[PDB]
Amino acid sequence: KESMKNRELKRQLTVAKYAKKRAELKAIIANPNSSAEERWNAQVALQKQPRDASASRLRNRCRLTGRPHGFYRKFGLSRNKLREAAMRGDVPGLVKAS
Amino acid sequence: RIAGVNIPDNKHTVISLTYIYGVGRTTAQSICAATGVNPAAKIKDLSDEQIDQLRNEVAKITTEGDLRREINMNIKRLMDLGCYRGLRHRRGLPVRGQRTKTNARTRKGP
Amino acid sequence: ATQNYGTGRRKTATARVFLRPGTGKISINNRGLDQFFGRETARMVVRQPLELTETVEKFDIFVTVVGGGVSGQAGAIRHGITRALIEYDETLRSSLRKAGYVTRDAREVERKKVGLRKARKRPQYS
Amino acid sequence: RRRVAAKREVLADPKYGSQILAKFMNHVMESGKKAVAERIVYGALDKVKERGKADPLETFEKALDAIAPLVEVKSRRVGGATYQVPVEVRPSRRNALAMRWLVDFARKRGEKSMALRLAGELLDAAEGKGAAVKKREDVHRMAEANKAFSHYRF
Amino acid sequence: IRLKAFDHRLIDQSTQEIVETAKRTGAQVRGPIPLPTRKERFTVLISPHVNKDARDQYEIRTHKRVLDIVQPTDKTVDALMKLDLAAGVEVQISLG
Amino acid sequence: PRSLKKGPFIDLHLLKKVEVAVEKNDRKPIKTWSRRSMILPHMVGLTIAVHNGRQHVPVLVNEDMVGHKLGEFAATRTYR
RNA sequence: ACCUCGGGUGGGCACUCUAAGGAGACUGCCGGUGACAAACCGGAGGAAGGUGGGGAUGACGUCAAGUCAUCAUGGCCCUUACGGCCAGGGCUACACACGUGCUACAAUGGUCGGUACAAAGGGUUGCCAAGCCGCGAGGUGGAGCUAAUCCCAUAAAACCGAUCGUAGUCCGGAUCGCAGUCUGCAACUCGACUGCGUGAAGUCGGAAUCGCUAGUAAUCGUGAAUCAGAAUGUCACGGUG
User: Fold this and answer.
1) For residues D120 and C7, what is the distance between their CA atoms, to the nearest angstrom?
2) Keywords, A to Z (chain F) (predicted)?
3) Could you say which residues 50-69 of protein chain F have a Cβ atom less than 7 A away from any atom in strand G?
4) CB contact burial F8-31 (16+ within 10 A = b; e otherwise)
5) What is the CATH number of domain B70-110?
6) DSSP structural state of residue C34
7) CATH number listed for the domain at residues A1-89
8) Are strands C4-8 and C13-21 parallel, antiparallel or unpaired?
9) What is the domain extent for residue D89?
10) D6 at interface of C, judged by CB pairs closer than 8 A
11) Which residue in F29, F31, F26, F36 sits closest to F68, CA to CA?
């Protein structure tokens, strides 16, 4: 859809917006020398943030097409747009071989 | 009665202690380590002296006549509460989260 | 001098074989020959081109082999020493061309192809 | 079917100095377990030298030629009647028929200590009371009931 | 000196553009040394709606190439870097 | 599961709708869509309306229900 | 030469290796055979002998074969919802039947103790060593590292010694109770592994039916993509043969 790319655009904003406090709240919990009173109130600040901030909510879709399945991260393309753009000599250094 | 149950003969000790039903294989390797009985000899070649020390270890883990009693109440606690793990455990379905549509035949028979 | 360099490859192995006059000194990777190849028939297969050309007692042998499999390194030495024996002349050329020792075995492993599961095995249909 | 098939050769037995035994060793190997099968064939070779004072190659040389048959059937159907024809076994083929019959009856011997199963097989066939010798002679008897079909619609 | 590009009809044709254009200015630069090659296979499915056993597999290469000076006294190649870069060659400097 | 470094789990809005709702005692069921949280000995004997998926079902909290979460007591699928 | 005995070091450019550029194989040559003409059967030499082995490359067309849910578009309908937004649930339900795939059914084995040899690949939003604490999965710890350097990373089968005596078993591991660690805001429906305990069916499997002509079938491991987490599948590389 087009309305479905648009709702997973703003997830990428809200993850990259906060992005620093959640490093600190997970720095407090991960220490064995940390006190649980400093841990328990640190648990409060995680769950009162909106949940669309973790990377697990983020879903790497194809950038030109939007199809979820068949994505590679050494490119930005889908499974079936990568073929049509490679036969036209665009992708540099890419050939067939055996 | 011999050690809680009858124990076979002409066998090594760790294999012989396996039938006591509450001690597996790794646990019976500790009992011969803690007491000092050599597993490499048979149970025939042993002395009638130190078997109490083997019988001391049986009085510290569990006994199958009461092991099956107490594990039933672990089942029975799950059933009478009506929790989901005891909900299917009343009926006969798998428990841990296996697949049910096909192939779960060792809880339903032929 | 009299040092003779011999190489030989079989089943992705590679053996440096040096050959010089000596008295039965067979040493491989600073190990004895009976110690290196543990319990196999190829302990004698490395001697088979040597005892064919009746020079089993007349040379030092220094072998360094890398890569390959267990019994693939033993074939690398057997191909390797035959190239080192023919640096002398071609008197033993006909004694080895007829023996079938000089030709490198070209039979290498084959790649997995799509649709198939092995190199040539394919799943069952009905 | 253009005729293609060339010949590949395996002849290696350094610890005993033999040629028939190496080809027999390949009929015992399962899935490339050669070093396992090598010590079982020698493991059933020394028990014969333990049993008989003669060199156990000759026991193996005699045990082949009382399992190896002479003629056998060949169900060549005329296309409307199923016939069988007793045919002369080619001299190259008749070695491998005995060695393949020998191993398959060793596996159903049902003893302990696996090299003793093959040990008893090579002892019997120097006499004739083996199951491989009884399987040999029974197929010999199948040819003479089949002997009417030797040339005629054959 | 180390060089990275995508085809051997550039990167092994720009070393002579550096070896000649540095040994001319007096300093000694030895012969270039090859390295192992990056090879990356990409097996992609080819049909839009599914038919699995029709596939197609590509490969992207990366050629490496290492130079070696002896006596550093020339800043001539430092100005002649925009010349020696042509289309797809990257040069990290290790002036030994 | 949920290893003992990070010991308990309960939801934040559930806690203020219980701990303050202890101070005025049990005269109402607690209607909550949350199912990820456990029950606790601060909550022995309450009445919770756990979301089935299309309705809420009542829960009689006992003392021997403490370790298990709320999910084992709401249904999902019928199979009549 | 050096050494502390590690190419450790000076050194060397012999080598292995790496990758650029070349030669080599054409029925060329010998004999026979054919209409002596294509060719065929033998022979020498040669690393290779008769398209050396493998791979990519699929003609005019067929089945109105498949896809409007990858994308693009003619038309048709919805446009106070057949469009948007957010919670929980669901696709993982379950007398049954069919398709592929893995283990097993043991003694060419099973355990314990030693010990030997690979290719190929990924890693500065990462790999995460030494030391270190844990029955064990791990926890600390922070190096080295932008890669023939550092890490992933210990190949397994084989071999050697021991016990095991062919018993539904020192076989097999399903189920299940209990106890743990890891990721993630969150392991109830619904994750993966670890400990301990319990131990099933299964003693080679009808009518039928499929794969394969040589580094091949058969058997043993390793890696990558997708990926916070999660492979018995897919793709890929080697051992023994």
Assistant:
1) 48
2) Ribonucleoprotein, Ribosomal protein, RNA-binding, rRNA-binding
3) 51, 53-54, 68-69
4) eebbeebbeebeebeeeeeeeebe
5) 4.10.910.10
6) H
7) 1.10.287.1480
8) antiparallel
9) 19-149
10) no
11) F36
Method: cryo-EM
Cα dihedral sign, C67-C72-C73-C75: negative
Find the CATH number of the domain harbouring C124. 3.30.230.10
Domain F1-80 has CATH 3.30.310.10: no
CATH 2.40.110.10 fits B1-69, yes or no: no
φ/ψ of residue C112, rounded to 5:
-75, 135
Chains that touch E (3 or more CB pairs under 8 A): A, C
Judged by C1' against the alpha carbon of E43, the nearest nucleotide is G235
Give the residue range(s) of CATH 1.10.8.50 domains in chain B. 1-69
Lay out the sheet containing F56-60: strands in order across.
F30-32, F47-51, F56-60
> Amino acid identity of C76?
A
Distance CA C105, CA E71 (A): 48
Resolution to 1 decimal place, in Å: 3.6
Residues of C whose CB is below 8 A from D14: 41, 43-45, 48
**Every domain of chain F and the residues it spans:** 1-80
Residue C89 beta carbon within 7 A of nucleic strand G: no
Give nucleotides in strand G with any atom < 7 A to a protein C-beta.
Answer: 14-21, 45-48, 52-57, 66-67, 69-71, 83-101, 107-109, 116-122, 139-140, 147-148, 155-160, 163-166, 170, 174-178, 180-192, 195-200, 209-219, 225-228, 234-241
Nearest-5° angle of CA E91, CA E92, CA E95?
110
CB proximity list for D32: less than 8 A, separation 6 or greater: none
